[PDB]
Structure formats: structure tokens, C-alpha cells
């Protein structure tokens, strides 16, 4: 019941301002899992469980989006310790994050970028429907299930419950925050999320982020370093509109002509993942 009596702790996988995750195996079915640790001190936002229970905001959000949809990692269970919380997350294999995939393969072909981007749009949408706003959409927070060709949104450590009123707080990735944040320290979830989606898309087709400094983010001029179709460039420029109100809705993004005829997850893997190239 403790924890070790259920899971077999393995080596260290990753770590950062979000936590320290270790490889793990569940005893009973040797099901591959990821064990994430978080110190109660490092925690900034807390929440109440559906049964009123002081817990990390991450746990709250994870349980709200944890169902059948394989678009976001599932929180299998969580434990509490005197100075930390432990999260048991599902862990697919083989797996590689979008950031390493991009760093390794470089700019992605548009066909593959369309499939990938489409899948994260569906995942983010899933979250919003469950009342969850991620706030840190970026290549590093997206895993690729190499065999299935399915992407998975991870790390809700900077999330928050979704609301229709302004947000005055933000502890996500700077280079992905919108010009409203940088200039006024306030924003709205959905439109701010669309902004990070545009950054992501650009990152997919160009191999790198488009902005580095606050002035670049505020100016909004987008220069393409790689050959990108006019439709894809237009979608990106549209998501990257300086004025939130001028950004497209998720519906408009998925209805955009560049977004059409997306490849099925399995076809994607068969065509772009199952290979040495």
C-alpha cells in the first residue's frame, strides 16, 4: 500500500522546475509507469479534490483530464508524503519528446507537422472541455508514442482550472507567453493557448522557436527560416496575432485549409516513425 510495495522504482528519467521523474514498473502487471516527485515547498498552487482534499494543483487537473482519451498522459494514482507528493503516470514505450524529435530530425515535413499539430489541438481541446487550461504547451511537454504515432500532452505543473475571466498569473515558458502577458501581465486562457500553438507550429515547420526576446514577441513580425507553404504560414501568422481578439478559435484552426486531410495516427507512424529516416 505504501508505494514501493506496489511499484518497482527505476533509474531517473528527467527533471526540472516541474519535478523529478523516475522510470517505474507496476507490480502485478509489469505495466510501465513514470513516478513523478514534487516537494510541497516547491508547490505554488494548491487545489481541492472533488471530495475536498488539500492537494497540488497538478493532481487536481490531472484527475479531471484522466479518462480514455490517449491525448494526455494519465494519472494512474498519487501518494502523499510528509514533504512531497508522488504521481504515478502512464508511460508508453518507445517514446521521445517533440523537442528531441525536432532536435534530431530538424524541421518536420508539413504532412507530419499537420498530423502532430492536429493531435495536440485535439488534446488541448480535450483539456479545455474538462475545465483544464494547460499553460505550457511546447515541444518539451509533448511525448510521441513512436509505434502508435500518437502524441501525448504532459506536465500540468503550470496549469490552472479553465476560466473565462482574465488571468494575472503565469509561470509557464516565457518564449511561449503572448504579447499581452509580456506587456500587461494579463491574458485569457483560450487566446493565450492559441498563441503558444502558433509558436509550436512554427517550431515544427522551422525547427526552432520564432521569438527569443520580449521585443520580438511584442513586435510580432514572423520571419520564416525554412520553406513553408503559404497556407501554413498564414495559419501561423493568424495564431500569432498581436491582438487576442484577432487570433482564430480552435474551430477556425481545425477548419483552416492547411489543417485538412490529416493523416491517421497509425498512418503517420507507418509513414514517418517506422523507419531509420
Swiss-Prot record:
It comes from the Eukaryota. It catalyses: L-seryl-[protein] + ATP = O-phospho-L-seryl-[protein] + ADP + H(+); L-threonyl-[protein] + ATP = O-phospho-L-threonyl-[protein] + ADP + H(+). ATP binds at residues 13-21, 36, 90, 97. GO terms for molecular function: ATP binding; manganese ion binding; protein serine kinase activity; protein serine/threonine kinase activator activity; protein serine/threonine kinase activity; ribosomal small subunit binding; transcription factor binding. Its cofactor is Mg(2+). GO terms for cellular component: cytoplasm; cytosol; nucleolus; nucleoplasm; nucleus; plasma membrane. Keywords: Apoptosis, ATP-binding, Cell cycle, Cell membrane, Cytoplasm, Host-virus interaction, Kinase, Magnesium, Membrane, Metal-binding, Nucleotide-binding, Nucleus, Phosphoprotein, Proto-oncogene, Serine/threonine-protein kinase, Transferase, Ubl conjugation. InterPro entries: Kinase-like_dom_sf, PIM1/2/3, PIM_Ser/Thr_kinase, Prot_kinase_dom, Protein_kinase_ATP_BS, Ser/Thr_kinase_AS. Its EC number is 2.7.11.1. Induction: By interferon-gamma (IFNG). Strongly induced in leukocytes by the JAK/STAT pathway in response to cytokines. Induced by different cellular stresses, heat shock and cytotoxic agents. Proto-oncogene with serine/threonine kinase activity involved in cell survival and cell proliferation and thus providing a selective advantage in tumorigenesis. Exerts its oncogenic activity through: the regulation of MYC transcriptional activity, the regulation of cell cycle progression and by phosphorylation and inhibition of proapoptotic proteins (BAD, MAP3K5, FOXO3). Phosphorylation of MYC leads to an increase of MYC protein stability and thereby an increase of transcriptional activity. This is Serine/threonine-protein kinase pim-1. The gene is PIM1.
Amino acid at each position: 500500500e505504501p508505494l514501493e510495495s506496489q511499484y518497482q522504482v527505476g533509474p531517473l528519467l528527467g527533471s526540472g522546475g516541474f519535478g523529478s521523474v523516475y522510470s517505474g514498473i507496476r507490480v502485478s502487471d509489469n505495466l510501465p509507469v513514470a513516478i513523478k516527485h514534487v516537494e510541497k515547498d516547491r508547490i505554488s498552487d494548491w487545489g481541492e479534490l472533488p471530495n475536498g482534499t488539500r492537494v497540488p494543483m497538478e493532481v487536481v487537473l490531472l484527475k479531471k483530464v484522466s479518462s480514455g482519451f490517449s491525448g494526455v498522459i494519465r494519472l494512474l494514482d498519487w501518494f502523499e508524503r510528509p514533504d512531497s507528493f508522488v504521481l504515478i503516470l502512464e508511460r508508453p514505450e518507445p517514446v521521445q519528446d517533440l523537442f528531441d524529435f525536432i532536435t534530431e530530425r530538424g524541421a518536420l515535413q508539413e504532412e507530419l507537422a499537420r498530423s502532430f499539430f492536429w493531435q495536440v489541438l485535439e488534446a488541448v481541446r480535450h483539456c479545455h472541455n474538462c475545465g483544464v487550461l494547460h499553460r505550457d504547451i511546447k515541444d518539451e511537454n509533448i511525448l510521441i508514442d513512436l509505434n502508435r504515432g500518437e502524441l501525448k500532452l504532459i506536465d500540468f505543473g503550470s496549469g490552472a482550472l479553465l476560466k473565462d475571466t482574465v488571468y494575472t498569473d503565469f509561470d509557464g515558458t516565457r518564449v511561449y507567453s503572448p504579447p499581452e502577458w509580456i506587456r500587461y501581465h494579463r491574458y485569457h486562457g483560450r487566446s493565450a493557448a492559441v498563441w503558444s500553438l502558433g509558436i509550436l507550429l512554427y517550431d515544427m515547420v522551422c525547427g526552432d522557436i520564432p521569438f527569443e526576446h520580449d521585443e520580438e514577441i511584442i513586435r510580432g513580425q514572423v520571419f520564416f527560416r525554412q520553406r513553408v507553404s503559404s497556407e501554413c504560414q498564414h495559419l501561423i501568422r493568424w495564431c500569432l496575432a498581436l491582438r487576442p481578439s484577432d487570433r482564430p478559435t480552435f474551430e477556425e484552426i481545425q477548419n483552416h485549409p492547411w489543417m485538412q486531410d490529416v493523416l491517421l495516427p497509425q498512418e503517420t507512424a507507418e509513414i514517418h516513425l517506422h523507419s531509420l529516416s
